[PDB]
């Protein structure tokens, strides 16, 4: 019933562009939408985000998160490890790779979502959410070695899965960070379950 | 350590703008980023809300109430939590209840309200409050819920059981071209993981 008629370029950066989308509304009237797209997509999706479950015997199961300065936000954010999928990379391989670079952990793939939208009223950005388990008792994850690329500066924050929401709220209150909406959504559902 | 040095406007549509962001990296070196912002944020503590609406009815399993609509940035239909921007002077809770009623017909009760969470913080400064609302589906008000969509709004309601949310989402993606939102998928994944 609704569909895109045309896309007009408004402005194109190196990494992001702004378009004016013309579309057919369900009444049969033509309407416009200002949209954002990345210039980097090739791929199943733009990026991956990793839900890393750190499993150590005789310890609570932790979710491994990252804290970074985010220039669009003007501040620090707490997020699932994540990055864009390299040209001709699978989402799983991007997931294990980004997890290693950002955290130093070597994980195993548990499951992989279909491409999911980030902010669909604003952009076409999509990611695969990849659930990964980390055997924290293996020697490779003893002294995990994070390999930041140029200009990446990432802090690792592991939080217990069984209290995640309350721990995130604490960091927000105490550290004036912004929690990521996907992280928060995950944390809410852990409390809402059953 | 890191902070914004300058924000230069590149292009300003009516709804969105693109900015060249200059910031100080933690080595003391000046770097740039291409940033997206909305033009609509005034004194709201966030751009928008998204509502987690838990529909509760005697002798029923709890449902999560979702909406499906065409998203011109995505060029297709998306399944999302009910959501909208916060009107000037409106509280996040009022916005949540109002959007829920407009989009679904249901009259909810506030349960909890998150702090401002970021939508896609490597791309944009956009933020939302995630507002959990219970819907008493045994109340007469909520028996024959009719969407009251605004101008150019065309929303379908999809209520799915909480106890099978992920598989029911998978079954919808399997049967048609449609993208699930990353917050909804994250929430459904945690419901499984718990
Ligand atoms: C910022 C994403 N664009 C919009 O919200 C919009 C609304 N009408 N036209 N474009
Ligand atoms: Cl798991
Ligand atoms: Mg990253
Ligand atoms: Mg990277
Ligand atoms: Mg909406
Ligand atoms: Mg609306």
Q: Hey, where are the domains in chain A?
A: 1-194
How is residue B98 written in tokens? 């109002």
- Ligand 1 pocket test, pick from A23, A31, A35 with the greatest ligand atom count within 8 Å of Cβ, gives A35
Decide: A120 in ligand 1 pocket, CB within 6 A: no
CA distance A87 to chain B (A): 19
Using alpha carbons, select from A22, A76, A133 the residue that is nearest to residue B72: A22
CA of A121 to the centre of ligand 1 (A): 7
Q: What are the residues facing A17 on neighbouring strands? A: A12, A37
Coil, helix or strand at residue B159: strand
**Quick check: B36 and A38 CB within 8 A?**
no
SS (H, E, C) A7-70: EEEEEECCCEEEEEEEEECCCCCEEEEEEEEECCCCCCCCEEEEEEEEECCCCCCEEEEEEEEE
Resolution in A: 1.5
**Quick check: A123 and B127 CB within 8 A?**
no
Q: Check the annotation: does A152 bind a ligand.
A: yes
Closest residue by Cα to atom 2, ligand 1, is A122
Closest to A189 (Cβ–Cβ): which among B123, B128, B190?
B190
The protein residues having their C-beta less than 5 angstroms from ligand 3 (an ion) are: A 82-83
> Is A1-194 in CATH node 3.90.79.10?
yes
The CA-to-CA distance between both ends of chain A, in Å, stands at: 38
Starting at the edge strand found earlier in the chain, the sheet holding A16-24 runs A3-12, A16-24, A30-38
Q: Check the annotation: does A82 bind a ligand.
A: yes
CA distance A128 to chain B (A): 9
Inter-residue contact A189 to B127 (CB < 8 Å): no
Give the span between the Cα atoms of A132 and A51, in whole angstroms: 6
- The DSSP code sequence of B76-115 is EEEEE--EEEPPTT--HHHHHHHHHHHHH---EEEEEEPP
Q: Is A28 exposed, middle or buried (0-12, 13-18, 19+ CB in 10 A)?
A: exposed
Closest to A13 (Cβ–Cβ): which among B3, B10, B162?
B10
What CA–CA distances, in Å, run from A99 to A68, A77, A142?
14, 17, 15
The CA-to-CA distance between both ends of chain B, in Å, stands at: 37
CB contacts of B183 in chain A (<8 Å) are 181-182, 185
Experimental determination technique: X-ray
Decide: B154 in ligand 1 pocket, CB within 6 A: no
Instruction: State the residue for tokens 């693109």.
Output: B18
Give B163's DSSP letter.
G
Give the span between the Cα atoms of B86 and B98, in whole angstroms: 10
Residues in chain A: 194
Q: Is the dihedral of CA A63, A69, A74, A76 positive or negative?
A: positive
The protein residues having their C-beta less than 5 angstroms from ligand 4 (an ion) are: A 83
Exposure string of B77-116, with b = 16+ CB inside 10 Å and e = fewer, is: bbbbbbbbbbeeeeebbebbbbbbbbbbbbebeeeeebbb
CB contacts of B122 in chain A (<8 Å) are 70, 72, 82
Cβ contacts of residue B107 below 8 Å, gap of 6+?
B97, B100, B101, B135, B139, B141, B142
Give the span between the Cα atoms of A182 and B184, in whole angstroms: 8
How is residue A10 written in tokens? 């408004």
B192: phi then psi, degrees, rounded to nearest 5: -65, -50
A152: phi then psi, degrees, rounded to nearest 5: -90, 135
């Amino acid at each position: 019933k609704q569909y895109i008629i045309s896309e007009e370029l408004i402005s194109e950066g190196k990494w992001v562009k702004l378009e004016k989308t013309t579309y057919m509304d369900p009444t049969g009237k033509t309407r416009t939408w200002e949209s954002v797209k990345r210039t980097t997509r090739k791929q199943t999706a733009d990026g991956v985000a990793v839900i890393p479950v750190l499993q150590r015997t005789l310890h609570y199961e932790c979710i491994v998160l990252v804290k970074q300065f985010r220039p669009p936000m003007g501040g620090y954010c707490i997020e699932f490890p994540a990055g864009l999928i390299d040209d001709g990379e699978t989402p799983e391989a991007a997931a294990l790779r980004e997890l290693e670079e950002e955290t130093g952990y070597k994980g195993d793939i548990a499951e992989c979502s279909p491409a999911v939208c980030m902010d669909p009223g604003l952009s076409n950005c999509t990611i695969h959410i990849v659930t990964v388990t980390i055997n924290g008792d293996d020697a490779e994850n003893a002294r995990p070695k994070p390999k930041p690329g140029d200009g990446e500066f990432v802090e690792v924050i592991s939080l217990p899965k069984n209290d995640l929401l309350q721990r995130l709220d604490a960091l927000v209150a105490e550290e004036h960070l912004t929690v990521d909406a996907r992280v928060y959504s995950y944390a809410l559902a852990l409390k809402h379950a059953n």
